[PDB]
Every structure is written in structure tokens, then in C-alpha cells.
Amino acid sequence: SGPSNTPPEI
Amino acid sequence: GPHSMRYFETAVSRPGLEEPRYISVGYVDNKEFVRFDSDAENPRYEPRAPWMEQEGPEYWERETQKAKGQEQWFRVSLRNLLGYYNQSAGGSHTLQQMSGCDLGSDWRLLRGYQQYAYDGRDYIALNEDLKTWTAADMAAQITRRKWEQSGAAEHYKAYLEGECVEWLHRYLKNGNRTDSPKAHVTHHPRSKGEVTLRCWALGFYPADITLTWQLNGEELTQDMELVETRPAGDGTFQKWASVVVPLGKEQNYTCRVYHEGLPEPLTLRWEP
Amino acid sequence: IQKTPQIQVYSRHPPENGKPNILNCYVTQFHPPHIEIQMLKNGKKIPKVEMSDMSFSKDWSFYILAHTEFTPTETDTYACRVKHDSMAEPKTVYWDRDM
Numbered sequence: 001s002g003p004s005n006t007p008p009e010i
Numbered sequence: 011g012p013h014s015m016r017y018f019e020t021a022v023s024r025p026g027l028e029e030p031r032y033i034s035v036g037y038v039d040n041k042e043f044v045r046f047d048s049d050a051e052n053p054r055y056e057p058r059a060p061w062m063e064q065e066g067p068e069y070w071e072r073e074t075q076k077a078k079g080q081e082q083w084f085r086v087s088l089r090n091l092l093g094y095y096n097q098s099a100g101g102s103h104t105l106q107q108m109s110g111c112d113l114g115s116d117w118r119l120l121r122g123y124q125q126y127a128y129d130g131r132d133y134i135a136l137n138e139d140l141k142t143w144t145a146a147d148m149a150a151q152i153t154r155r156k157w158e159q160s161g162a163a164e165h166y167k168a169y170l171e172g173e174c175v176e177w178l179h180r181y182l183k184n185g186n187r188t189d190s191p192k193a194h195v196t197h198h199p200r201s202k203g204e205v206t207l208r209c210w211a212l213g214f215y216p217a218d219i220t221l222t223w224q225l226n227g228e229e230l231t232q233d234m235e236l237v238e239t240r241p242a243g244d245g246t247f248q249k250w251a252s253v254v255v256p257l258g259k260e261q262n263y264t265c266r267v268y269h270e271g272l273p274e275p276l277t278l279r280w281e282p
Numbered sequence: 283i284q285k286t287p288q289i290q291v292y293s294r295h296p297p298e299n300g301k302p303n304i305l306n307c308y309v310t311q312f313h314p315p316h317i318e319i320q321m322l323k324n325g326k327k328i329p330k331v332e333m334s335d336m337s338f339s340k341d342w343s344f345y346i347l348a349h350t351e352f353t354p355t356e357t358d359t360y361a362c363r364v365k366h367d368s369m370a371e372p373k374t375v376y377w378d379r380d381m
Contacts, residue, residue, distance in 0.1 A: 001177040010087035130313040
């Protein structure tokens with residue numbers, strides 16, 4: 001099960 | 011063994027009004043098991059190993075929804091990166107991500123990973139403590155400042171210690187394996203009274219392997235030629251190693267193949 | 283930023299003249315991901331060449347496997363030609379059945 005990136009973005 | 015899961019993600023911007031292309035690939039123990047590609051007909055996560063075909067459509071829909079989230083987060087990041095490096099917008103850039111966990115034989119987290127690269131170069135990476143970031147770069151300090159202020163490390167830590175680990179386990183139970191190498195040596199002429207001996211290992215899985223040449227019990231690490239392990243295309247691998255020896259002295263050299271599917275390492279010589 | 287492709291050309295099975303087989307062109311270690319790969323038989327482009335999906339490695343660099351059906355013979359010559367932005371002009375690597 002993959003990652004779900006949180007804000008803040010880069 | 012040292013079990014692992016990885017997700018490898020890439021967004022590549024394109025000139026002329028196109029959305030970036032986003033590809034995500036999941037790996038269990040270095041073998042590809044899922045894949046999402048935004049260029050596809052109806053973009054969704056698809057199974058890439060047989061043992062994923064048991065999952066219900068809820069699994070796919072959920073993963074597919076995450077990917078649409080990542081696609082967007084990647085797209086906004088790319089835009090920001092362009093501004094951080096003072097770059098023009100005619101062009102083509104990449105953002106890559108590596109995420110995952112390493113588990114022990116006891117099913118316990120050994121190490122979690124969270125790394126990014128911009129245009130193929132290290133950008134920012136979560137350290138082994140899972141609380142601090144190492145930024146490789148002037149621009150990546152900007153990013154590091156934001157994520158320290160927001161506590162983003164906590165979010166990634168929770169995913170790596172929890173979900174990543176639990177799902178790796180679930181996938182291993184779902185997937186319960188080696189293929190031993192078949193080895194042989196070939197003989198090849200050279201000039202000036204010399205010969206090449208080549209030790210081949212073929213049809214092996216997993217990819218990890220060691221090949222050594224011996225002269226009278228002493229290892230020839232020095233002048234051994236070695237190719238990078240290569241895929242055969244059928245899910246197995248290939249490798250070879252070679253030494254230049256004097257003509258007529260071939261029987262003095264022994265090849266040894268070390269692979270985890272083998273009862274004992276293989277030991278062999280040139281057999282005319 | 284540009285990283286130069288490394289190429290191996292080799293068959294899936296041990297080659298026997300006249301027995302059908304698969305010929306592989308394994309292209310690794312490159313950046314950026316856009317690449318053009320051709321497989322050639324006696325200097326001429328081979329049609330219907332299978333191309334794996336794109337992947338990258340732990341060092342961030344991209345790799346790709348191209349393959350095709352082929353029947354080796356004593357005198358048929360095979361190669362793999364790669365166009366990429368890291369090289370001035372295309373790189374051709376010829377199949378050597380001993381390697």
C-alpha cells in the first residue's frame with residue numbers, strides 16, 4: 001500500500 | 011530474510027500545455043507487484059504479479075485514489091521546483107520519490123525510507139531517525155524549513171512504521187521461492203599464449219549472486235571481468251565472470267557460484 | 283544532470299544456431315528518461331520490438347529492457363542502437379554470443 005504525501009508539497 | 015517494500019514514483023513535465031506524466035511502481039522484495047501510469051487509457055493501479063489478482067476492487071480503487079493525490083502533489087512540487095532553481099518553462103524536468111520499509115525475519119521494522127530527487131539528483135531525504143531531513147541543496151533548505159515547521163516527518167514516520175509494515179506482511183503471506191543458477195564455463199582464445207575463461211550463471215532468482223575465480227585456493231578479485239546482473243526476460247537472471255589465464259594451465263582455475271537457492275556453492279572448472 | 287546509457291546485448295537462452303530464441307537489449311543507468319531504442323538485424327531495423335515499462339534504480343537512474351524474437355545463425359549479425367540526449371550520436375552495441 002502506497003504513500004499518500006502530506007502537504008506542504010516541495 | 012531482510013524483506014522489503016518500495017514505492018518508486020516519477021513525474022516528468024512536458025513542453026506544450028501537457029500535464030506531467032506520473033508513474034508509480036510498487037516492489038515487494040525487489041519484484042514489481044503494482045503499477046500506475048497516468049498516460050494509460052483509464053489511469054489506475056494494475057497488478058503486476060499473479061498473487062495480486064486476489065485483491066478486490068476496493069483495494070485498487072483506494073490505491074488509485076492515492077495515486078491521483080500523488081499526481082497532484084507532484085505536479086505542484088514540479089512548478090515550485092522550477093521557481094526555486096530559476097528555470098524556464100519550455101522544458102522537461104523530473105521529480106522522483108522512493109518510499110518504503112525493511113523488515114526483519116521477526117517482522118519488525120529495520121529501516122524506513124523517504125527520499126526525493128530532482129532532475130536525477132538527491133534533493134531531500136528523511137534520515138534514519140525518521141524525524142530529521144537532510145537537504146542536499148540550497149533549494150532543498152527551503153523545502154526542509156517548510157517540513158520542519160509543519161511536522162511532515164511525523165506523517166511519513168507513521169506511514170513507514172504502520173501501514174507500510176502491515177501491508178508488506180499481508181503481501182508476503184499472499185505470495186508464498188528461489189531458482190538455482192545453472193553454471194558452466196566457456197573457453198575463449200586470446201593472443202600471446204593466453205585464454206579467457208568465462209563462468210556463466212543462468213536462470214537464477216533472486217538476482218543477488220556472487221561469482222569468484224580461484225587460483226590454487228586464492229581468490230582472483232584483481233583481474234576478473236564481471237558483467238552486471240541482467241534480466242533474461244522470463245523472471246530469472248544472468249551473470250558471468252571471466253579471467254585471462256595462461257594456455258595449458260586452465261585446470262588450475264576454479265569458478266565458484268554463491269546463491270541463496272543453492273545447497274552448497276557451486277564449484278566448477280573448464281571441461282573440454 | 284545527464285547520465286549516459288550502459289548497454290548489454292544478449293540472448294535469453296544459450297544460443298544454438300537455427301533454434302528460436304529471444305534477444306535482449308538491456309539499457310541502464312540513464313537520465314533523462316526519454317530514450318530511443320532500436321534493434322537491428324544485418325544493419326536493418328527490426329519491426330515489432332517489445333519494450334518493457336520504464337523503471338528506475340536506487341541511484342535514481344532509469345532502465346529499460348527491449349527484446350525481440352530471433353533465430354541465431356552462423357552469419358546473421360544483430361545489434362542494439364540507442365539515441366539519448368547524453369550522447370552526441372547514437373550508440374550501437376552488437377550481439378556477441380560469447381558474452
